[PDB]
Write a structure and sequence with these properties.
This is part of a larger assembly, with two copies of chain A (53 residues). Chain A has 53 residues and is low in regular secondary structure. Helices cover 9% and strands 0% of the residues of chain A. The N and C termini of chain A lie far apart (99 Å). Chain A: It comes from Pseudomonas phage vB_PaeM_E217.
Chain lengths: 53, 53
């Protein structure tokens, strides 16, 4: 009895459509940059220049 | 440009003598057009250094 189902029975819902993706992408850091904190930064010169006096 | 260059010469008269005839011959002369080119190319730092003076 029960005839034939034509299609192969299986779980209906795929794994996707059931996944939520976090809005953010983490990044790698690398070593710290602490020259600015110790000394500071002075913007005095201009580009296409050669020397500071 | 073209040229005409007629031709012909005469003989003494006669009652039953053969009649001389005249003609012409044209020619053509030609010239060729020649084209040249020249360009320029400027960078960024080069332009800045040049404008510095």
């Amino acid at each position: 009895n029960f005839t034939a189902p034509v299609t192969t029975p299986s779980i209906p819902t795929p794994i996707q459509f059931l996944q939520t993706w976090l809005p953010g992408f983490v990044k790698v850091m690398t070593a710290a940059r602490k020259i600015d904190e110790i000394i500071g930064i002075d913007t005095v010169g201009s580009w296409e220049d050669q020397e500071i006096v | 440009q073209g040229i005409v260059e007629p031709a012909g010469t005469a003989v003494e008269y006669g009652d039953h003598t053969n009649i001389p005839l005249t003609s012409w011959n044209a020619n053509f002369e030609r010239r060729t057009i020649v084209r040249g080119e020249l360009g320029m190319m400027v960078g960024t730092l080069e332009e800045g250094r040049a404008s510095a003076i």
